[model samples]
Target: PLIVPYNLPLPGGVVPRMLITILGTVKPNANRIALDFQRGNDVAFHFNPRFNENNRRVIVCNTKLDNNWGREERQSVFPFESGKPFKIQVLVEPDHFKVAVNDAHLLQYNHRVKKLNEISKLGISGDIDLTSASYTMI
Candidate 1:
């Protein structure tokens, strides 16, 4: 069985052409969920989907460096819903991450922490039943 707040180290770190997949079902009353790629104490990428924020559904993407968070890039095209299963893919490119939900292109986030190979951890948390998290290179 899988658990929330799950985390693991990526053996070779993240590189261009890498695809990270997350499969999960949002809790019926889910408010939000977060997926993060981290290097030590810094977050290279933070992908958060909010079910309801002041009655608005949005996706927030940002980075945290030296314990400080950067400006949030919010997307209003919400593709997730409560009590539904979702497949999220983060494709690492040389300059940005291409994110897809349910096999549909969603959004892209530019790299804020440029040393991609130093991002060694994958972390997931909040308001969902995570089924599987895996990565591939193609």
Candidate 2:
């Protein structure tokens, strides 16, 4: 039951076509999961999956700037299940981050923090035990 944020440092920061991969298992009682491309206190993209947030299956995407959370864009397609292993790939795009779950397209979040190179960090947390995580810049 050890859960903590996992951070991956991007040496040259994020660039278009860079890919981030996360391999993990969802806890049986998992309530949520989130991955973020961030720089210090500013988050360029936030990919959050809420298993039962308000009793609904949803994913929220947004950005945090200066510690303030921006508007959340919700997606209803959820590909995660409790007690199951999952593969998540987040591809960096010119204007958004395209995410896929288990080899299927999940969703995309348009960049709110414009400078992609400034996104030099990746953060992951909540109800998951990551077996592997990596960043490949292109």
Best by TM-score: 1
- The digit string of per-residue lDDT tens for model 2 on 14-119 reads 8888889899999898999988888778988888999998789899999899999989899898999999999999998988889999999988888778877778
What shift in Å separates residue 36 of candidate 2 from its native position after superposition? 1.7
**What C-alpha lDDT does candidate 1 achieve relative to the native structure?**
0.92
Pairs that collide, model 1:
none
lDDT of each: 0.92, 0.87
lDDT at 102, model 1: 98
Write down the TM-score of every candidate: 0.97, 0.93
Q: In candidate 1, where is summed lDDT lowest over 10 consecutive residues?
A: 4-13
lDDT of 2 at 81: 94
Give the per-residue lDDT digits (tens) of candidate 1, residues 1-138: 389999967875899999999999999989999999998899999999998899999999999999999999999998998999999999999999999999999999999898888899999999999999999898
